[PDB]
Amino acid sequence: GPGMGASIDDYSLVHKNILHSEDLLKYILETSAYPREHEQLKGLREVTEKHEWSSALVPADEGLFLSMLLKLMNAKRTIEIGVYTGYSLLTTALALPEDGKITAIDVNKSYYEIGLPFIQKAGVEHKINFIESEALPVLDQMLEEMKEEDLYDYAFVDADKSNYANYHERLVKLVRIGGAILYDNTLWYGSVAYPEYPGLHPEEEVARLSFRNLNTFLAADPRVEISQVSIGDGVTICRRLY
Amino acid sequence: GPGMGASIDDYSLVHKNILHSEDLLKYILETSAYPREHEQLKGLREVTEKHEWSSALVPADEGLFLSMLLKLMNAKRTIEIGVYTGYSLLTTALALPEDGKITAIDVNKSYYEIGLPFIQKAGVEHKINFIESEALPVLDQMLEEMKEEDLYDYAFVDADKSNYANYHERLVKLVRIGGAILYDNTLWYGSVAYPEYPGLHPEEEVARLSFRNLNTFLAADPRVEISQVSIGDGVTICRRLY
Numbered sequence A, B: 001g002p003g004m005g006a007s008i009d010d011y012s013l014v015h016k017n018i019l020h021s022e023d024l025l026k027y028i029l030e031t032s033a034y035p036r037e038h039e040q041l042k043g044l045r046e047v048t049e050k051h052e053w054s055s056a057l058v059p060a061d062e063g064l065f066l067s068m069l070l071k072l073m074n075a076k077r078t079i080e081i082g083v084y085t086g087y088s089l090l091t092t093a094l095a096l097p098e099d100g101k102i103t104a105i106d107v108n109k110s111y112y113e114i115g116l117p118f119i120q121k122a123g124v125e126h127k128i129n130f131i132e133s134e135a136l137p138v139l140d141q142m143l144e145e146m147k148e149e150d151l152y153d154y155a156f157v158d159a160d161k162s163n164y165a166n167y168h169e170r171l172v173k174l175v176r177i178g179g180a181i182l183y184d185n186t187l188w189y190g191s192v193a194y195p196e197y198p199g200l201h202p203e204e205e206v207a208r209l210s211f212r213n214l215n216t217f218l219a220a221d222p223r224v225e226i227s228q229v230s231i232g233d234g235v236t237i238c239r240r241l242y
């Protein structure tokens, strides 16, 4: 993946999409997304489209959905897990109020520094505390240190696609009651629809199985209410109940 | 569409699915939606499935997406325009607190009485003020009475497609600043993605052009922020800015 492991040329799902045609997706982006996309988000996206791992980028229509959720729930304190070049991070920082705060975690800060000039020109870098690390030790460290009024309103999870289940067990204690946890890519290009699926590289197949297990688990998890949304590559919204 | 006498066999656009396969939609419904669907929503859905206009039903995955938005924004007072048998209305009523209030408007109360026994068994009928009328005169009258204490948190628009732009001009005054206005069917089975789309019923073509105009308008309307979400038949979330 982009963080470590296999090359991009080993991946086989990246050109698929969950909608029934590219024309419909293109219509959504040109009609409803790009006209509402901040100038620095446009610039960050255009640089990233030339990067080796452009396939991992959160798309522009999903970005506006993330922004809308953040504003409707009046989020102020958030955590971003899996930053890459920072498109979803810049989306979050633009949506939060002036005093919003973001904990952003990624194993590769060189990716983040690609998007940083656009984040700085947007004027919202002051909201971001970037941590270069594997996410799990940071999350475990945070659980030891966090007080009850330090809880997060919102978490966006978009990092190692086979470790979401481990992330979940921490985040249901790091996000406030009534707060939101969002898992990206829970439809995995449609490949979760079958128990067996042909021809995937091991990293892609392991992620596919991980999402099938996670999707079943989240639907049975009494600690949250859920909604799996067929936007982007599938986004599952979790709201903490207790 | 749904209206006494009208036959579904005269229409081309019936079963909603903009995903790339029936199996993918079935996966979402069976994995993430039906296990989280209230027993009275299940009962309402299953009796509606035998009705002539069962294809008008808001799908179960979209329903849980509406519920999640309502809870995340802590909505308390809402309006529902286009009720049919009451699936989205019961979804709203179950998501609101015990003392929440809904203004529900539909030209055909007989449809509502199909789902009413399930609304009653769910214990939320007391939240609902059902008005049997065309929605436009009701909204105009609402502009004459209510003030900011009576502004709505949330509006779901799912009635006669050619009147959405007219509904919008009232709802941007009836919903509070920061409140949400949602429009169902804004991708109209994918047919909005092209300038021309052969093979439609005349009323379906009027709706298709209405949505192409609406989608362009909403993307340009400075009074709201938007997110068009590729769920169900397309849902456009609008958030009132001022």
Ligand SMILES: Nc1ncnc2c1ncn2[C@@H]1O[C@H](CSCC[C@H](N)C(=O)O)[C@@H](O)[C@H]1O
Pocket: A002, A003, A004, A056, A057, A058, A081, A082, A083, A084, A085, A086, A087, A088, A089, A105, A106, A107, A108, A111, A133, A134, A135, A136, A158, A159, A160
């Ligand atoms: N174990 C781990 N801990 C933290 N980040 C990880 C990780 N494994 C992979 N990652 C990072 O997760 C990212 C996934 S791509 C994330 C996309 C980004 N949210 C966007 O808006 O476009 C990569 O940058 C990768 O470096």
Ligand SMILES: Nc1ncnc2c1ncn2[C@@H]1O[C@H](CSCC[C@H](N)C(=O)O)[C@@H](O)[C@H]1O
Pocket: B001, B002, B003, B056, B057, B058, B081, B082, B083, B084, B085, B086, B087, B088, B089, B105, B106, B107, B108, B111, B133, B134, B135, B136, B158, B159, B160
């Ligand atoms: N002018 C109008 N004013 C109010 N309702 C109207 C209308 N024209 C049509 N309708 C109603 O709009 C509905 C569309 S179907 C709505 C489905 C419903 N929201 C669900 O959850 O399944 C029909 O019940 C129809 O009677």
Ligand SMILES: Oc1ccc(CCNCc2ccc(O)c(O)c2)cc1
Pocket: B001, B002, B011, B013, B014, B015, B055, B056, B057, B158, B159, B161, B162, B184, B185, B203, B204, B207, B233
């Ligand atoms: O002017 C029209 C023309 C055709 C239709 C039928 C569309 N297919 C069923 C349907 C009906 C109403 C809905 O709200 C919905 O999502 C799905 C409706 C209104």
Ligand SMILES: [Mg+2]
Pocket: A056, A057, A058, A158, A184, A185
């Ligand atoms: Mg992703």
Ligand SMILES: [Mg+2]
Pocket: B056, B158, B184, B185
């Ligand atoms: Mg509809």
